[PDB]
Symmetry: C3
C-alpha cells in the first residue's frame, strides 16, 4: 500500500531592510508531498518507508526532487526507524508551540544546532552517508524518544562525532511537561543542549507555557521563552516573548492570529521582532490535501 | 486529495539534414506525470497545487525531476494562481490550433518569445526566483486571462522587467474569436506581441481559421497563419500555411493526419516545411492515462 | 490509470577489510518506487509507461530522482517496449537464481558487462541518448526475448556500437532450460557473451541448477555456477559454488537463508566468499508495498 499526502501554503513574507537592492516583501510559498509505503502483517507488525518531495520559492534550478529515505517497524506501540530519522530534540512536545504565522516561525524556538529530519537533498554532499537510528515508545500519557545519528556511517566510528538524544513528554487534561537532552548536537563536539518546558491549559480555548533552553555552544546562551494562545471559536490569537543570555540582545516578541477557514484550510499572520531587532511580518494560507 | 494523471507518447521524428554525423531520424518520446493536490471546502472555495515530472528523450543525466510548484484558488468561476503559472498568451484559444503530428507542432505557431508554464527545472538558475500571478474568469462563452510575471521577485521591481498579458476568447456553435496582448514578453523590454484569431466551424467535422500575429522584437515580424482540419469519423486531416515578414523567408506549410484508435490512444503523423525550407516529418502514438 | 508499487529493504552489510579507515559493517538500505501509467483499450491493446524513483544508502546529494522512461505496447502476449528497456540477457530465467541475502547477491552471477534496465539517472551523461527496443513473446511454456540497444541514437549508426541480444527459456513442472546470447554486450565491440542453464526441481521444496557462462571479454573467462535451495515450510536454505577460468582465482561459494515472515515481508541473510577471497555477510528485511 502506498499513500500520498501533503500540503501547500502561500502568502506575503515581509522583513524590513531585507537587503540593499532587494525587495522587503516577496511571495513565499511551499509545496510538500509525502510518499508513504506500508506493509501490514497479521502478526501485528507494520513495515513502512516514506519519501518527501518538497519545493520552496527560491530553490535552485526551479526544480523538485526526493530526499533520503526513512524506514521503520512498529509493534506494540514501539517504533524503530532507520535512515533519515526524526530526532528526539526535534520530536518532543511543547518545544515549537510558540510559533505563529503561515510559515510557523518564532524567535522563541531554540537557538541551537541539531540534527532533524532532512526534507530536501543536500548539494554539499554532507548528508551522502548520514544515517540514523531512532526509537519511540508511548506508555500512555508518557512519550519516549531516543535518537542516534552518524553523519558518515562509512567512516570508522572513532573518527566521527555522533549525536545522541533522549527526550520525554507527559500530559493530562490541563498540565504538560517535556524535557530533552542531546549530546554532540549537530555532530558538533561539546555542543550539549537541553530543553525543559511546562504548559498549563488554563481553559479549553487557551494555554500558557514556559520553555527553557541550554543552547550548547550557541552564542545565544541560555534562553527562556514565554508564550500563550487563546481560541475564540475559529480564530486563535498567539503571543510570545523570548530572552537569551547573549550580551546586548533585544527581547524577542511576536503577536499573531490563526483563522480556521475550513477543515484543512488555515489562514495565519504575524508580526515578530528578533533578538537583533529584526522586524518580520507574514500573512498567508495553508491547505492540506 | 491527491490525484495523478499524465500521458506517454512515442514514434519516429524526422528532419532532413539534421546535422553532419547525426542521424536524421530518431525515436522521440515523452513521459508526463501531473501531481495535483486539492482541498475542497463547503464554503465553495477550492485550493490546489500541482507539480509536474516530465522526461524527454535526450534529457540530461537520463533523469527526471519535478518542476516549480503552482498554487491556485477557485471560487465562482474565478481562479487566482501563483508561482509557476499559465500565461494569457499561452492560454488563449485558437492560437495553437494549427499544430499536427504526435508532437503537436506547427511553424504556424507564433514566432515570438514569451513566458509560459515551465514543465521542467532549469539548470541555468534563471527561474530560481521566477514568480507569477495569473487570473482567469469565465463569463459564459467569454474567457478572460490576465497574467503578471516577475523573473526575479527578490530583486527590487524597478530593476527587473515584468511581463504582463491580457487575453480573451469567445465562441458559439460555429464562430470563434480570440485576441491577446503581452508587453515585455519573456521579460524583454519593448518586446510587445499580439494575437488576433478567428475560426469558422463550417460543419461539425471541419473548421477553417486564420491567426494573425505581431511577433514583437522577433526577426520574423508580422505573421499570418491559415489552417483547417476535417474529421472523417475517426481520422482527422489537417493542413496549414504560414507567412512572416522576414525578408527572403519561405512560405511554411504542413499536411497531417490524426487517428483516434481508442479513447485515450491517438495516432498522428505529419510532414512540414519551415520558413528556412526545413523538412520535418513524424509518426507516433500518444496515450493518456 | 496510474498505479504506484515498490519496496523497502534494510539491514546490516558486512565485508571484511572494506578499506583502511572504513567501517566493515554499515546499514545498507534501499527504497524503490515504481510509477506505472497504463491505457487499456477494448481493441485488446494495452499502452503503458513506467518510471522509477530509487534511493540507496550512499547516494550523492542525499537525494532521489526519476530515471529515463520506458514505454510499451502489449497485444496477444506480444510486447514491444521502447526507451529504457529490459534486455534479453538480463531478462531470461535461472540466470540470477543463485542469489541470496536481502540484497539478492551472488558471485555466481555472470561476470560480464551488458546493458540492463537503468534504475537511476547517470551524471556522466553516458545515457542521455541511450535508447532501446525490446520484444518478448510467450508461446505457452516458452519465453522469447529480443533486445536492441543504441547507447547514442542521435549519432550516425555506423559510428556507434549497438548491443543485440536473443534469449529463450522453457519450463514444465520439474525441468527448466534457458539460453541467451548477446553481441557487443554493453556496447563493447567483440564483447560477445552467452549463457546456458538447466535446473531440476527435485521436489516441491527444492531445486538444483547449473549455469554456464561465456563472459566475453571479461578477464573472468568461462564460468560455471552450481546452486541449490530447499524450503522447510517458511524458511528457505540456499547454497552455491562458482568457478571461473581466470588464473589463480578462488572458488566462490555462499550459504544463506530466507524466512517468509509474512506475505510481503522477507528476512534474509548470507555469508559469501568471492573469487578474490573476499568475505561478505548480510542480514536484513525486505517489505513490498
Amino acid at each position: 500500500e502506498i499513500s500520498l499526502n501533503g500540503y501547500g501554503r502561500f502568502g506575503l513574507q515581509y522583513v524590513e531592510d531585507r537587503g540593499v537592492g532587494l525587495e522587503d516583501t516577496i511571495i513565499s510559498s511551499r509545496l510538500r508531498i509525502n510518499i508513504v509505503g506500508t506493509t501490514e502483517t497479521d502478526q501485528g507488525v507494520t513495515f513502512g518507508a516514506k519519501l518527501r518531495m518538497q519545493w520552496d520559492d527560491g530553490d535552485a534550478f526551479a526544480g523538485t526532487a526526493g530526499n533520503a529515505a526513512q524506514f521503520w517497524t512498529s509493534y506494540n506501540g514501539v517504533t524503530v526507524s532507520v535512515g533519515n530519522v526524526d530526532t528526539a530534540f526535534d520530536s518532543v512536545a511543547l518545544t515549537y508551540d510558540s510559533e505563529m504565522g503561515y510559515e510557523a516561525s518564532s524567535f522563541g524556538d531554540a537557538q541551537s544546532s541539531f540534527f532533524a529530519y532532512n526534507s530536501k537533498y543536500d548539494a554539499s554532499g554532507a548528508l551522502d552517508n548520514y544515517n540514523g537510528i531512532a526509537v519511540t515508545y508511548s506508555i500512555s500519557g508518557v512519550n519516549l524518544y531516543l535518537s542516534y545519528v552518524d553523519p558518515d556511517q562509512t567512516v570508522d566510528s572513532s573518527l566521527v562525532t555522533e549525536e545522541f538524544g533522549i527526550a520525554a513528554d507527559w500530559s493530562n487534561d490541563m498540565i504538560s511537561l517535556a524535557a530533552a537532552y542531546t549530546t554532540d548536537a549537530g555532530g558538533i563536539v561539546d555542543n550539549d543542549i537541553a530543553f525543559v518546558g511546562a504548559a498549563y491549559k488554563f481553559n479549553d480555548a487557551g494555554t500558557v507555557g514556559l520553555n527553557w533552553y541550554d543552547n550548547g555552544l550557541s552564542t545565544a546562551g541560555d534562553q527562556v521563552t514565554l508564550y500563550g494562545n487563546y481560541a475564540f471559536g475559529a480564530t486563535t490569537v498567539r503571543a510570545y516573548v523570548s530572552d537569551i543570555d547573549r550580551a546586548g540582545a533585544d527581547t524577542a516578541y511576536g503577536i499573531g492570529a490563526d483563522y480556521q477557514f475550513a477543515e484543512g484550510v488555515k489562514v495565519s499572520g504575524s508580526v515578530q521582532s528578533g533578538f537583533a531587532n529584526e522586524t518580520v511580518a507574514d500573512v498567508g494560507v495553508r491547505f492540506d490535501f
